[PDB]
Amino acid sequence: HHGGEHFEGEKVFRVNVEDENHINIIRELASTTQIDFWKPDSVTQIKPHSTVDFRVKAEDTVTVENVLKQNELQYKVLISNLRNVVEAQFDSRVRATGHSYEKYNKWETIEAWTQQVATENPALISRSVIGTTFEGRAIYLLKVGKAGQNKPAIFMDCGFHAREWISPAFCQWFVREAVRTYGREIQVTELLNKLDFYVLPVLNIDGYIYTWTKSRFWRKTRSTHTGSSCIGTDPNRNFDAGWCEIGASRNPCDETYCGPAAESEKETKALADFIRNKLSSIKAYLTIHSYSQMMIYPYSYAYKLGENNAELNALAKATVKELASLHGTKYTYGPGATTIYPAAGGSDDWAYDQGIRYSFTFELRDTGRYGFLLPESQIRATCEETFLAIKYVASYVLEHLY
Numbered sequence: 001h002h003g004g005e006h007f008e009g010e011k012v013f014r015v016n017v018e019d020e021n022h023i024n025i026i027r028e029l030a031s032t033t034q035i036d037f038w039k040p041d042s043v044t045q046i047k048p049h050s051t052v053d054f055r056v057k058a059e060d061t062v063t064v065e066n067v068l069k070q071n072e073l074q075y076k077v078l079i080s081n082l083r084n085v086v087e088a089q090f091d092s093r094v095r096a097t098g099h100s101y102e103k104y105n106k107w108e109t110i111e112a113w114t115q116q117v118a119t120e121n122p123a124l125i126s127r128s129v130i131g132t133t134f135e136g137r138a139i140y141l142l143k144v145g146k147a148g149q150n151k152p153a154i155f156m157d158c159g160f161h162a163r164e165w166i167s168p169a170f171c172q173w174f175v176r177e178a179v180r181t182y183g184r185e186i187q188v189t190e191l192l193n194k195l196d197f198y199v200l201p202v203l204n205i206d207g208y209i210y211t212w213t214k215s216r217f218w219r220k221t222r223s224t225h226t227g228s229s230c231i232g233t234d235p236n237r238n239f240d241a242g243w244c245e246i247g248a249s250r251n252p253c254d255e256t257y258c259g260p261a262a263e264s265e266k267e268t269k270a271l272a273d274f275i276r277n278k279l280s281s282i283k284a285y286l287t288i289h290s291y292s293q294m295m296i297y298p299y300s301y302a303y304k305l306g307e308n309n310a311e312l313n314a315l316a317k318a319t320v321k322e323l324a325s326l327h328g329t330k331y332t333y334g335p336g337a338t339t340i341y342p343a344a345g346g347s348d349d350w351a352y353d354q355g356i357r358y359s360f361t362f363e364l365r366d367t368g369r370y371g372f373l374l375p376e377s378q379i380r381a382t383c384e385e386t387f388l389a390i391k392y393v394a395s396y397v398l399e400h401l402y
Ligand SMILES: [Zn+2]
Pocket: 160, 161, 164, 288, 289, 290
């Protein structure tokens, strides 16, 4: 069930690379066999002394593993039969149908939920449409907060990469906790009285739907071309921040295709347009991804740091400590170029270059045991600890307005 049958026999490997020859063996592998990179996003993003997580087709696992053995590369099999892990994602004990904050929800469900949560809490939540996807779906934005004059705002989005299902789940949990605890908990009451939070539960709606209907591991948008038969752009390489200069692909068929132009995707244009329009009120930009348990700040497109990088490092350090306090979960943090790898076109860098001084990417659980297939039974714990981190950051921003 749940499309797991399609992944029978597939495996996810973790390979250690220590030098360029190790990396060139994976590159050669990728060039002759169909490899779905999980972490990093692409062969061009692999560094010396790092690990690489990737999914292999059933008919190719022997080949891959024999290359790994022959070249005597250190590796492990993270997942030996992907079918079982795909099916085991759906392990909620929630007894009920329809939306749940402790299940992964289909888009029609999330869409109906955005309307229902706004109707039921009209003093704290309003919904708007900030644009339309390539396929024609309305892109909803929730504004969370008690009405006030000239309020500062925090912008938080989820669902850039279609297969990263824990990210939209987190955006929903945030709204859950806002509604559940406003007026009962003074910190949340003050945060929502003093700030607006714009929460975008799924940006890449077309891709998200696709992961439920046809291709669980799809990540890009679903835009087509009149010429190429390839589909989709990587939304987090599509922003106007050193656009496509490094760590992205110009080939429409690659998973890290930067698009035919900056802001070519209707979805990223809608986001960028909104932030341009609300620039004088937005004081922080937070973008939610998975997996690997990191908190990243600019810059990713370049080996340079912002004026306030020491501030960002201290705030990240304190935030990940707050996060760990609940369930012990360990995050790493730092500037993207050196913590992860240089890559252009990211919304976090773009936002920061627009003058939004607090800009962070969060990569949620886990660290590869399940990867994108993080079970429903971990949604609550993941979201609880993440919520502590977002509250910490928001409270900081309130003390450091500008
Ligand atoms: Zn992502």
